[PDB]
């Protein structure tokens, strides 16, 4: 018989709480059985017991490496069901912070992938940059990661007077850090030996297994939701979509590095083209009024009271809204029954489908190869378990 | 628009072939990696000297909760229960009654800090700036019970941290 092994949950390479039951012949991997739910918190029922504003912070904690992207997806779904439109400055801020969030996520993914394979230094080099982006998060919202900044009306608050200068200062130097990481990894023969031709997946299999994002693009599929189905102002920025040709771990790593460079490009464009104006929709039956107006005028106080006690009502109907989150397609199926509380909120996490394909990807590989394949799928279990 | 990441072809002349042979047999790229690590060795580290040095924060930072007063010393809170209604974690418990002088004040204001998510929705909902998230983040305890705050603890926090809370509110209220 084969040897049965528990890989995780208490394992450095398990990416949190994951019970990988492996059947092994020697160190050859005969079967992978991922057991999840060790971080299932029942988010969707809890959301069923909240108003639309009260449910927003749950999306921060779904994928706790890309917070504002989940906030953006949920806000877009609620906006679609509300038949309202965010103001242009809010949309530009949304895209800027989405690209910053993509930078954060890609740093985490690449550095922890290298850490699992056995390279520890780039993690330390890039987490200082992560800390600076956390400072940007805190200066805009008061929290380092769980901002709750992007809301179905736009954004909570406008930028502080000196934020754009500091973002520009960080962006003009991040490319050298990317270059140093590349010098450490890209041409190293040990890295290539550990990554090239590992976890190969064909384009047809990737499509049928429900993959998205880099897990498609590494196999040559020319798909990107920001280019084919743009949402906020992504039709007004210029960038390239990196495409792989081998469908292995190495090509996906190259794609993620190139996507970081393209994110720097988009951030530059967003910094140059930030427009003036209000930062939430000028409709007090949706977005709360300013504090000065709330303490001065009767209607403003009434609407503030009602929006913070009962919340705004959403017309009945169901939507499926998806965005190109840093880990792939992130979606929300939101159903409204006409009241201030959602009837149903199904969350679609790309990591769910990506982990469901782990057994297919590990055929004919070893234990360390499976560790690399786990790293290459970019899995966070907050979104997988929900 | 798209670009390829791994679609190049090496040169097959004697010069390039010998260069690749030298790279294979003499470990050039590994030496480059060693040089990068040696370069990082001689840089100044990014470590700060905690607790003598502190990490940078902004006036918007959300930390330990506090209840505030008017300059006369009268409490700002008038027990409207908007913070209780809006709290996403149901971390706030409020009971109120008419005071001896007829004022609308609370007899119970509890925050479970082990339920709270520190989202700051209560301070946005409050119409009189009574409940705030302060700047303090160093308040770890040795027991679970010390983190179940009552009204006396929150009023003490307000009296303790008002000197910084008022200045922080002064710097950001024009954005609110």
């Amino acid at each position: 018989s084969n040897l049965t092994l528990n890989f995780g949950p208490q394992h450095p390479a398990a990416h949190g709480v994951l019970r990988l039951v492996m059947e092994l012949s020697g160190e050859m991997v005969r079967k992978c059985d991922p057991h999840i739910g060790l971080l299932h918190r029942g988010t969707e029922k809890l959301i069923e017991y909240k108003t639309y504003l009260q449910a927003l912070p749950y999306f921060d904690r779904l994928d706790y490496v890309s917070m504002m992207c989940n906030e953006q997806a949920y806000s877009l779904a609620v906006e679609k069901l509300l038949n309202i439109q965010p103001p242009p400055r809010a949309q530009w801020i949304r895209v800027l912070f989405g690209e910053i969030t993509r930078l954060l996520n890609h740093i985490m993914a690449v550095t922890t992938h290298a850490l699992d394979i056995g390279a520890m230094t780039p993690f330390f080099w890039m987490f200082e940059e992560r800390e600076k982006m956390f400072e940007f998060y805190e200066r805009v919202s008061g929290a380092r990661m769980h901002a709750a900044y992007i809301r179905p009306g736009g954004v909570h608050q406008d930028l502080p007077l000196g934020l754009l200068d500091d973002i520009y200062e960080f962006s003009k130097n991040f490319s050298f850090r990317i270059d140093e990481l590349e010098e450490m990894l890209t041409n190293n023969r040990i890295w290539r030996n550990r990554t090239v031709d590992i976890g190969v997946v064909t384009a047809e299999d990737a499509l049928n297994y429900g993959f998205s994002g880099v897990m498609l693009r590494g196999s040559g599929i020319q798909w990107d939701l920001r280019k084919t189905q743009p949402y906020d102002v992504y039709d007004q920025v210029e960038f390239d979509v990196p495409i792989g040709s081998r469908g292995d771990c190495y090509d996906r790593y190259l794609c993620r590095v190139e996507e970081m460079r393209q994110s720097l490009r988009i951030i530059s464009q967003c910094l140059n083209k930030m427009p003036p104006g209000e930062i939430k929709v000028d409709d007090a039956k949706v977005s709360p009024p300013k504090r000065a107006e709330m303490k001065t005028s009767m209607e403003s106080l009434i609407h503030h009271f009602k929006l913070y006690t009962e919340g705004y009502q959403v017309p009945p109907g169901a939507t499926y809204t998806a965005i190109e989150a840093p880990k792939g397609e992130f979606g929300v199926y939101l159903v409204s029954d006409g009241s201030s509380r959602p009837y149903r909120c199904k969350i679609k996490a790309p990591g769910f489908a990506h982990l469901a394909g782990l057994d297919k990807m590990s055929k004919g590989h070893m234990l360390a190869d499976v560790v690399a394949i786990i790293g290459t799928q970019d899995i966070v279990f907050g979104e997988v378990d929900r | 628009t798209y670009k390829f990441v791994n679609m190049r072809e090496p040169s097959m002349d004697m010069k390039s072939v010998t260069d690749r042979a030298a790279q294979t047999l003499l470990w050039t790229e590994l030496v480059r990696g060693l040089g990068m690590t040696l370069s990082y060795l001689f840089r100044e580290p990014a470590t700060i000297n905690y607790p003598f040095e502190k990490g940078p924060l902004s006036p918007r930072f959300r930390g330990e909760h506090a209840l505030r007063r008017y300059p006369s010393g009268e409490e700002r809170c008038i027990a409207c229960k908007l913070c209780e209604a809006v709290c996403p974690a149901q971390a706030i418990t409020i009971e109120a009654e008419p005071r001896a002088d007829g004022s609308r004040r609370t007899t119970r204001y509890d925050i479970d800090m082990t339920k709270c998510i520190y989202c700051g929705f209560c301070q946005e909902a409050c119409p009189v700036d009574a409940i705030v998230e302060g700047p303090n983040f160093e308040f770890s305890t040795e027991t679970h019970e010390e983190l179940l705050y009552n009204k006396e603890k929150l009023l003490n926090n307000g009296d303790k941290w008002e000197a910084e809370i008022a200045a922080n509110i002064q710097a950001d209220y024009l954005y609110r």
Partner: peptide, 29 residues
């Protein structure tokens, strides 16, 4: 009733930001 003051890019624009890969050859034959 002064002029609107908001966080905005400076007059003109910000300086160009590098994003392309930069790995010099840096070696003998």
């Amino acid at each position: 009733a002064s002029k609107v003051k908001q966080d905005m890019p400076p007059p003109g624009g910000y300086g160009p930001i590098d994003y392309k890969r930069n790995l010099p050859r840096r070696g003998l034959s």
